[PDB]
């Protein structure tokens, strides 16, 4: 398989060779390859989407098609690589974005191919190559994407091996990557474990970690639209996205109206206390999150505990306290608790607790500029969406570019080509200021 | 002593308290404190300069005064914290630079107070506070600077403890910093050891490591001025700066002219083979760089091996091969070998070897745009200065701002306030595009 190797040292050596060419390619040459990658991503979006759902059992095909189309359309390319200039009597000083070299990347089972293609487009734009250690549960989908990238590059005239991977990823192959002297940077997309591992590696690590995004709805919101947006955001790819709404904090005065719209118009099923207990018992196991429930749709999860609901149902909701395990924990399931708040200050406090200091994502429905400001300052997240579904944060119905690697822990935010470059100052003394 | 604590946990707790206030201060409020820090740095520059030379035995007072004046004048303040906006029918998306929190910093014995004051100005501007583990050989100078910063803040109305430190820094206090859960970021300014340690810490590390900066002089250069600039750059603060010229690669045709100007006009003393052997034996010990020679002036180093030279002498020079230990090693001494090159491609090769893949700093004297471009691409350094002394790279006679923390290893380049912030995207959906 193209770009795929039997062991991690081979993969890195191949990437290192390719990068000696990529670093000397024109922007127009990189951009021709990037353009081919975008094209083939759209052309094979259906195949990538169904492969991921088949292999992992998580998410859904239609939404994954939209995610791949988003990656293709809105991931930045070489235009993201920019230059500054300062000039005067003392000359001309430029600051440029140069390559790191061969970048290592550790990718998730939730958005396997999305992360690989997005990372690759950005890293290539800056003159790097990339080697992946994919999630072992999504290895076929991940390596198919690597194969596609290399096909796209060949169709543009090479080189081969701009993106490389391994046939069988292990913690051993990941340790080879994290101690390899030809890898100065690793981008980890996943949970707290992998982020910590990379930040202990002796290399710069970009840490894109976990979240538990609250959405606050106050009494000044468009409540009918808030119901639509929140359920749309929560249930997108069955709640796999790290940015998605995973619990609601609602001001008392509008909480009933909100929940009623959710049930009446947005395909939500309200579960009783008894049902909550049974669902909790299923989805949180003695060994943690039940991997056989992650990324499953609502009707399936309800069926698993013997609740037969019609197929118009796409989300499970209930009112509860913030400490309820289905509200406090990141489930990546279309299960959405509503926490009632007595006042806006109460609601902000509740939301801040629920975000658990991840500083990842949070959302609000409010039309009031002061309310928005207060929440935004307090919650201090890499992402904040106002009056839209969560997916507006990555360019799906919001201004701005797409990424699938949100560096919550290390502070680089929504990563793009510029993230994966080294800054270079060049001082031309006493010449080339033409003023 | 103000801002100084008996142990590292106390220091961090104090910094954490102060940061809850700093993060809510206006830019105008931070800038009033920064302005007071700049003022007191200038007012006490003579004291800081002489304290460092007295305590460490390295460098010289007059040059250290200029370095502190540079820090005060050209370190960026709150103007370095900037915002982007994208807007259209889908609304308004901002990207802001928010604080990390309490930043840890590990600082050198070469530029102790310069690094502390520069780091503090930048970190404060972004809403952070900072805790230092200074170099134990410069602890008095380092903590005097911390004391000055806190005095400056008090004079501006507080808070106290924006910059904190410890009475006695150890590897134990450094380990407390690197495992502390209230520290999400550490800025390490020093050699390969400390950079590696921070990149193993489980936190984001900004790694400002070692160099061995070559200066290439080709046959199109202004050779008389190249001699002046190179010796000025090399001998500044007795070659302590990490950016300073530490060896020359000279095209054959101009090498004699260059060296002759150095001897005749720039206070250089040309040492024989025999003298080279004796100097090597002194300055490189069985245990590595001789700490009793680092940062000493040329006349002193020559005296130490029994060579009496007049006091017009400020640099030791000789012609040699690139592998000569006084040419290949970063000495931080005004000892400057000249390596003769047969052709420009030869000269670039030699310079690239001499830089040792640090990707830190390199310099060139050439008036030819193609020659400059070829060298710049090949040497791939955070800093490149053309036709000036090295110190043009940090705003001393070149366009651009000052820093004392150049993140060669981790890629952030010349660090400033913006470096020490977390990126935050805020998506206001379907409103606040006024076009
Ligand atoms: N911030 C982001 O951009 C982002 C994007 C997608 C997913 N996520 C997060 O990731 C989680 C879901 O994805 P997942 O289950 O694939 O994540 P995961 O953390 O279980 O796995 C991600 C990758 O890290 C590897 N990994 C895990 N632990 C490791 C360790 N100790 N050492 C080395 N490698 C290790 C896995 O093999 C995989 O390749 C959720 O918490 C989600 O919020 C974050
Ligand atoms: N890139 C830059 O901005 C920059 C600036 C100044 C100095 N330097 C480099 O630093 C060196 C000279 O300074 P120095 O002798 O003070 O550097 P050093 O590396 O000996 O010490 C710097 C700091 O790191 C600490 N330290 C050293 N080893 C450590 C370890 N294993 N764990 C934890 N802490 C450790 C020291 O106590 C000190 O506070 C030169 O190589 C120079 O080029 C680089």
Author numbering:
A (entry chain A), B (entry chain A): 28 to 462
Paper text:
Here, we study the kinetics and substrate specificity of an AldDH enzyme from the Clostridium phytofermentans fucose/rhamnose utilisation BMC, Cphy1178. The overall structure corresponds to other members in the aldehyde dehydrogenase family, with a catalytic domain (residues 238–427, highlighted pink), a cofactor-binding domain with the Rossman-fold type nucleotide binding architecture (residues 28–108, 127–237, and 428–447, highlighted grey), and an oligomerisation domain (residues 109–126 and 448–462, highlighted green). The catalytic and nucleotide binding domains come together to form an extended nucleotide and ligand-binding tunnel that is open at both ends, with the catalytic cysteine (C269) at the centre of the tunnel and the NAD+ cofactor binding at one side.
To understand the co-factor binding properties of Cphy1178 we determined the structure of an N-terminal truncation, comprising residues 20–462, with bound NAD+ cofactor to 1.6 Å resolution. Glutamine 357 participates in hydrogen bonding interactions with O2 and O3 of the nicotinamide ribose. The two structures differ only in the position of the loop between residues 215 and 223, where P219, G220 and V221 are shifted toward the adenine ring in the NAD+-bound structure.
